[PDB]
Subunit: 223 residues, 3 copies
């Protein structure tokens, strides 16, 4: 079942990528860069999850580590944060320093998750905690300085940014929650339960987010 | 013999790098970035192939030799070659870094599928190989489609040079996955020594040959 | 003791990062990018050294592989910081900056490979890293210093100071490497551990204190 779920996921990622490509052909004022980002996220996640489906992107450590998830997130999650940052900056001057601040925090976050998964006892929760601290700083930037950039770009953009910021932030907190509850953490949730959460969540983050984000930006277009 | 061939290759890479450096000292209107790219490609490839020569950049897997240092080489050298080709198309005009990074992304993915395919067995090997070939087809479509149209937007003389270097590189591109599939990593029709010689001779034309043709053609545009 | 030293180091890195963040809040004409670089260097090094403290970032000769994970990010960022100092108040030369980044990343990789190697092979890789370092030094005191000079007497004086500071530390690393267990094995493991605790405090925090203070002073 776990293999089949991952095959299904990869197919949905492909469909998402194709939808974003078709959107890119009639871009409605959204720069090509934002369509490229929207396409890379699901295609990369799709490839990573395909490796799990084929029984390659996981190994035994007694307990199963789905290491292909970290290979996925270390690329897909910084790209999602870049997408969010470019949305805030839409129609205005770019702040690439702030964008790369978020990328740096996020990459660190995913690495702490991988190391935590390879760790046991207190060490696991030290790494997990450092990842959570990274996430809190990302949230502070998202609803603080990055939102202030969004506000500087007008009422309609700021309203859209706030919506996609809440959307992504809601999903963000779900990942480390599922991680902690599942076999990698406290082991309250069964393996199959965790697998389903990390199949369903990413559909909303790797395709859902970009549908909402691109549609909202496209709606701002005159003509 | 395999060791000696790799020592020889690394020395040729060094000579190529030095030639591009000397060219960079009298640049004839070619930006320093294009000389840097031209130098990094052979130096990186040279280092990777030196590791094979020293007997480090290979190991035994499925009773076959995996020259993993080739993938370490290509994952850096091949995206840089595509960047060189993309900057040639954009020479004397506005840059399209979105298209450039599209090619970089496709190419890095392509090399990764090759590494995973080499580590795989049976149907799984050819699933990864196939995804890499799909990436290459999209690269070729970009190269002779939208990227060539950028070249044409920069005038007859530039477009003529771009088309020449695009054909040169494209011809070499298709050879790599052909040799891969025919050799021990794939169907095993071609002998290991034959594959070794192909992956010594081809790269001399791509790591040095391409940049000689590319830089000379761009330099000729100078008055 | 080795564990305790690494915990202490990671705490100093955290304090350094916090200081640079506080400085960033009243930037005095220094772009946010230079404060971001100053913060990433110690935080990344701190994380890597924490992994050694926890007994994870090494395998047993003992290879402290977490040092290479540290340097492959921290050292290119230090060179970027130095390059941006040279270019302060003038046009950026990102080609020269990325030239230094490329040389430096290659340099650290040769160090890791050399550490995993034995005999003549080890010293071939070590030698390639040294050649990379020499080219970095030639760029630092040649073309990069020329950019600094083009940006006025006060900037050039500050650049020259931080260039000598960083260059002094640079040459120490491959010297200690060669003398220690990774190389000739003349220096004891504990001695090498202390050197690679003390040196980095001066490079990951010291350099940016001197660098940022000097640039901030140009606001007046
Ligand atoms: C794109 C991401 C790729 C996932 C990595 C694939 C796993 C490596 C193969 C392991 C194996 O064959 O046992
Ligand atoms: C990974 C490490 C991150 C450190 C990198 C430095 C930030 C570079 C951003 C360049 C900023 C350009 C101008 C701007 O838009 O702010
Ligand atoms: C691989 C790269 C890893 C990067 C290093 C990991 C930790 C990085 C964190 C630095 C980012 C902190 C920036 C906070 C201040 C932002 C602001 O001024 O608004
Ligand atoms: C500041 C916030 C950083 C810390 C955040 C999360 C802490 C959660 C870790 C607790 C799990 C311990 C369980 C256990 O030890 O069995
Ligand atoms: C613990 C959970 C913390 C997460 C959310 C913090 C929200 C921050 C709100 C804006 C503060 C940033 C600012 O205004 O500069
Ligand atoms: C992990 C693998 C990552 C490899 C990526 C490295 C290769 C990418 C190079 C991109 C170069 C693009 C630089 C644009 C030059 C702009 C200019 O010349 O003005
Ligand atoms: C520059 C890139 C060069 C990379 C080469 C990696 C070679 C690593 C060899 C490790 C030693 C293996 C062995 O001798 O068993
Ligand atoms: C396989 C993973 C590789 C992913 C690396 C690249 C992902 C693409 C992300 C961003 C694209 C950058 C576009 C830069 C826009 C500059 C403006 C322009 O000239 O078009
Ligand atoms: C594979 C062969 C490449 C085909 C090139 C088609 C050109 C596309 C276009 O004109 O947009
Ligand atoms: C022209 C192609 C060169 C290679 C042809 C000979 C193949 C040798 C072999 O079967 O191993
Ligand atoms: C060296 C390997 C390949 C040779 C490539 C072409 C030879 C030089 C031609 C120069 C030119 O076309 O101006
Ligand atoms: C963030 C920087 C961290 C990098 C080093 C992490 C090393 C983790 C290895 C764990 C292996 C083990 O538990 O034995
Ligand atoms: C391997 C990873 C290497 C990471 C180090 C690279 C970062 C270089 C940062 C250069 C930023 C320059 C732009 C600054 C500005 O324009 O303000
Ligand atoms: C690995 C790195 C290989 C070299 C990659 C190329 C990056 C060059 C960046 C070009 C910036 C042009 C603008 C400038 O020179 O200021
Ligand atoms: C250690 C020895 C290595 C070299 C130090 C710097 C060499 C001289 C710098 C370049 C001088 C110049 O270009 O004018
Ligand atoms: C400072 C004091 C120096 C302590 C002694 C140094 C020993 C180096 C040789 C191992
Ligand atoms: C012009 C449109 C280009 C589309 C290419 C999309 C890039 C995807 C990269 C693959 C990553 C997996
Ligand atoms: C053992 C499988 C390794 C696959 C390589 C995936 C790409 C590197 C990690 C993300 C960058
Ligand atoms: C450790 C793996 C490295 C992760 C990096 C993945 C790429 C994310 C960087 C996003 C950059 C896009 C922003 C460009 C601005 C467009 C104008
Ligand atoms: C990932 C570990 C980071 C440790 C802290 C780094 C130093 C302080 C960073 C604070 C950033 C605050 C950004 C929001 C400003 C309002
Ligand atoms: C034992 C099976 C239970 C599966 C539960 C899946 C829950 C998915 C909800 C997504 C958030
Ligand atoms: C997979 C979740 C998709 C959510 C998209 C919502 C519909 C578009 C809103 C505009
Ligand atoms: C992978 C190896 C990286 C090496 C980069 C090549 C750098 C050579 C020096 C660049 C030339 C700049 C000199 C300007 C004066
Ligand atoms: C090995 C067996 C794999 C069977 C499923 C292949 C599906 C490929 C989709 C791309
Ligand atoms: C690497 C696998 C990619 C899967 C499909 C990606 C989405 C479609 C890409 C279309 C190619 C664009 C070429 C431009 C033609 C003009
Ligand atoms: C003018 C139309 C462009 C199509 C070019 C055909 C594809 C080139 C073949 C590449 C293989 C060598
Ligand atoms: C005017 C000089 C101010 C120096 C402040 C030093 C702060 C050091 C931060 C922690 C380093 C360990
Ligand atoms: C047997 C001992 C050989 C040691 C080699 C050390 C020399 C490496 C190059 C030094 C550059 C100055
Ligand atoms: C501590 C190492 C210092 C190396 C540089 C010394 C030579 C610099 C030459 C500059 C020319 C003026
Ligand atoms: C490995 C330890 C060697 C002792 C120190 C060598 C010189 C470095 C500067 C102090
Ligand atoms: C110069 C950089 C600092 C040097 C510190 C040397 C400490 C050596 C202590 C050795 C004690 C016995 C192993
Ligand atoms: Na070019």
């Amino acid at each position: 079942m776990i293999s089949i779920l991952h095959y299904g996921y990869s197919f949905i990622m492909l469909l998402g990528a194709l939808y974003f490509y078709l959107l890119s052909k009639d871009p409605k004022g959204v720069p090509a860069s934002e369509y490229l980002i929207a396409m890379v996220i699901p295609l990369w996640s799709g490839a990573a999850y395909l490796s799990i489906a084929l029984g390659q992107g996981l190994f035994q450590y007694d307990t199963t580590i789905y290491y292909a998830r970290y290979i996925d997130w270390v690329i897909s999650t910084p790209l999602l944060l870049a997408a969010l940052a470019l949305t805030a900056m839409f129609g205005g001057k770019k702040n690439l320093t702030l964008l790369f601040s978020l990328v740096a925090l996020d990459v660190f976050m995913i690495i702490t998750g991988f190391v935590a998964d390879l760790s046991i006892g207190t060490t696991k929760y030290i790494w997990y905690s450092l990842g959570v601290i990274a996430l809190i700083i990302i949230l502070v930037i998202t609803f603080g300085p990055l939102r202030r950039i969004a506000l500087s770009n007008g009422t309609r953009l700021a309203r859209h940014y706030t919506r996609v910021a809440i959307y992504l932030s809601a999903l963000w907190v779900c990942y480390p929650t599922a991680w902690l509850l599942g076999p990698s953490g406290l082991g309250l949730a069964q393996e199959l339960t965790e697998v389903l959460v990390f199949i369903i969540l990413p559909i909303f983050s790797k395709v859902g987010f970009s549908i909402v984000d691109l549609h909202g930006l496209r709606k701002l277009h005159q003509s």
